[PDB]
Ligand binder design. Structure first.
Ligand SMILES: O=C(O)/C=C/c1ccc(N(CC(F)(F)F)S(=O)(=O)[C@@H]2C[C@@H]3O[C@H]2C(c2ccc(O)cc2)=C3c2ccc(O)cc2)cc1
Ligand SMILES: O=C(O)/C=C/c1ccc(N(CC(F)(F)F)S(=O)(=O)[C@@H]2C[C@@H]3O[C@H]2C(c2ccc(O)cc2)=C3c2ccc(O)cc2)cc1
Lengths: 230, 245
């Protein structure tokens, strides 16, 4: 790759990811109905956001779709946890759809995943997660989630090199904030280990979508391919 | 205290050096078990699932003995030890399998006498999808030149990390348990960085390799979740009895 993405400084990588951030959307107004409509509107923004993640458009269309297929629900979930950080005990699906755990029990099948999302929001709060760190983590999910389940060798190499640039960026942010070398490596590990919990929540979420008879609302390969080209 | 925040556990686990942590984890490694001798081939779905179930059930007993020797693990309540093992057991079996399989490209070494290619994974329902994910992880460990000392650190991280976010309590006790787990996880990070610095990696290479290793743990979680979904498993009570025995 002749890629500009691999020439970016930590400051340029953060600036690109901050400028690509989607807005917070409102619910339009059935809990599953509201959430499905919100997710569908978020997906359109997510496609346009992914195209602005440095290195993402260097991939084939097929590899872009594979990464989005694997990451879309993890990306929605980390957004939700980020929006909810400053509302302890609550999930801010949207500014006009803020649910506490009491309302999560009233809706069958909600509460187990609700509780996992609340624990993630609490962990982000306890770590004082910064916006610059959040955008790095969301980009890692996009590039990392599908990379182990793929020209192909060159594509995987390029993804790992962009992932290395995002690591460098996270470490730069922490060094600039005044963290010791030891604190830098410890916080990097703490952030990346939360990604294992977001993967778990995404898998449980998919299983719950299936059990609610909502197989239809998962974006297909073909849907993502058409949205990328459109 | 106000001046020096620490774990509240009455424990030397957090006082270990990086060298002592690696030594403890290496010495705790469970044995490699064999499958049945000369089983009827070709396998059916039932006989393959029979062999794998029997091997996993025997591995579980040794995994409990290993978990008890992970520094900091026995400082937790019995209930929290079982929660961590409940959440991590299949990921721990899977990273063991990927480690054993590293030197056999295209194959999964379930045991020295049970070496399977992806074709033999088709015998069991949706097991080829997970077979292929396990092969890609073994290739990734090969490509990274994963070291034994790194592997034992990663397997201990899985044990402590996988269930830590689903202690949903916020009693003083629960906060102390979570704080202790995060401090032991920080010590294992320090240990991994020490191993990389000792090997001669630059600071930039150390942070990049640390990130590459921890991001593979997200894929092992994925494979474990898909495995469970495809299946439909040690009970709380079974794990609790094995911990006390
Ligand atoms: O009976 C009813 O009306 C409804 C019952 C109900 C039972 C479970 C439930 N989920 C658990 C939790 F905690 F989030 F609520 S979930 O399926 O995992 C899943 C998690 C989160 O909520 C669901 C979802 C979704 C995604 C695509 C879609 O097409 C429809 C829904 C998510 C989401 C959406 C947007 C966003 O920005 C972030 C996250 C949600 C409602
Ligand atoms: C419970 C259960 C959860 C998932 C499942 N799978 C469908 S799988 O992901 O392919 C799973 C991975 C691998 O193939 C399966 C298996 C297994 C594990 C327990 C069991 O009782 C029976 C079979 C394996 C394994 C065994 C030993 C080892 O050292 C490493 C891996 C089958 C059952």
């Amino acid at each position: 790759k002749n890629s500009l993405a691999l020439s970016l400084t930590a400051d340029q990588m953060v600036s690109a990811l901050l400028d690509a951030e989607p807005p917070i959307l409102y619910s339009e107004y059935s809990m599953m109905g509201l959430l499905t409509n919100l997710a569908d509107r978020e997906l359109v923004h997510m496609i346009n956001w992914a195209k602005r993640v440095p290195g993402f458009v260097d991939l084939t269309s097929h590899d872009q779709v594979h990464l989005l297929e694997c990451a879309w629900l993890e990306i929605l979930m980390i957004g939700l946890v980020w929006r909810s950080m400053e509302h302890p005990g609550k999930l801010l699906f949207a500014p006009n759809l803020l649910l506490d755990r009491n309302q999560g029990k009233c809706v069958e099948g909600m509460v187990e995943i609700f509780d996992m999302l609340l624990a993630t929001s609490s962990r982000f709060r306890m770590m004082n997660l910064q916006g610059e760190e959040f955008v790095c983590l969301k980009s890692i999910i996009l590039l990392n989630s599908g990379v182990y389940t793929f020209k192909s060798l060159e594509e995987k190499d390029h993804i790992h090199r962009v992932l290395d640039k995002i690591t460098d960026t996270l470490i730069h942010l922490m060094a600039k904030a005044g963290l010791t070398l030891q604190q830098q490596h410890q916080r990097l590990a703490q952030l990346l280990l939360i990604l294992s919990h977001i993967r778990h929540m995404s898998n449980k979420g998919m299983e719950h979508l299936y059990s609610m008879k909502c197989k239809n609302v998962v974006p297909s390969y073909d849907l993502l391919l058409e949205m990328l080209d459109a």
